[PDB]
Structure 1
C-alpha cells in the first residue's frame, strides 16, 4: 500500500492512496460473466482475465456511484 511512501507525505495522503488502491486491486465481478477476475489495465480501463472482457469504468473502481445510476432511470 502506501508503505512504499515510507515516512513521507503524511497520514491523509497515503491513507487515501491505500484505500483507493485497496478497493482498486480487490476482486471485481465481471459484468459480462460474473467471475471476480476484473483487473485495471490503465486509467478507467478494466479487463477480465477470464473471458477477456475489456471495458470502461471509474478511474480506480470499475463502477462509480453515478455510473450505477444510469442503469436505473
Structure 2
C-alpha cells in the first residue's frame, strides 16, 4: 500500500491510495473465464493471465458502477 510514502502526505492521501490499490490488485474473476486472474496492465487496461483476455475497464477497478449499468439497459 501507500507505506512507500514514508511519513509524508498525510492520512487521506495514503488512505485512498492504499484502498484504491487494495481493490485494484484484488484476485479479479476474469470475464473471458470465471477464473480470478485479472491484472491491471496500465491506466484502464486489464488482462486475465488465464485466457490472455486484454480488456478495457475503470482506471483502477476492472469494472465501474457505470460500466455495469451499460449491460443492464
Superimposed CA distance per residue, residues 15-71 of structure 1 (whole angstroms, 9 cap, x where no aligned partner) = 000000000000101111110000000000000111100000000000000000001
How many aligned residue pairs are there? 73
- TM-score under structure 1 length normalisation: 0.98
Q: Tell me, in whole angstroms, the C-alpha distance in 2 between the residues paired with 1:54 and 1:45.
A: 7
How far apart in 2 are the matches of 1:5 and 1:58?
A: 24
* Structure 2: runs of 5 or more not aligned: none
Runs of 4+ in 1 over 3 A off after TM superposition: none
